[PDB]
């Protein structure tokens, strides 16, 4: 499951990412080197996802006790793309296709 709909649906129902996601730190621990675009070599069929997304810019709606996390969408191999699923602790799901410049609601 690595599509915007697939993941979105999975999260509001299961409240966790599908098993194909690993954090940056887990990835790094397995030999991932971002500068090399080698994720699919060291962690075949996994995608980066699950890390806290700051929202420093306040672009996503804040709320006390609301934490945002991100996950890559549509990744298969090579360098990460520009697609990200943004999801809150309360299961609001937003999407960005431009490296977090802009966001639109998907759930």
Curated annotation (Swiss-Prot):
One of its GO terms (cellular component) is extracellular region. Belongs to the ribonuclease N1/T1 family. The chain holds residues 51 to 157 of 157 of the full protein. This is Ribonuclease. Hydrolyzes phosphodiester bonds in RNA, poly- and oligoribonucleotides resulting in 3'-nucleoside monophosphates via 2',3'-cyclophosphate intermediates. It is found in: Secreted. Its EC number is 3.1.27.-. Its main location: secreted. Keywords: Endonuclease, Genetically modified food, Hydrolase, Nuclease, Secreted, Signal. It is an enzyme of class 3 (hydrolase). The active site is at residues 70, 99. Disulfide bonds: none annotated. It comes from the Bacteria. It comes from Bacillus amyloliquefaciens. One of its GO terms (molecular function) is RNA endonuclease activity. Introduced by genetic manipulation and expressed in male sterile maize and rape by Plant Genetic Systems and in radicchio rosso by Bejo Zaden. Barnase expressed in transgenic plants will specifically destroy the tissue(s) where it is expressed. After cell transformation, protein expression and plant regeneration, the active nuclease destroys the pollen producing organs thus rendering the plant sterile.
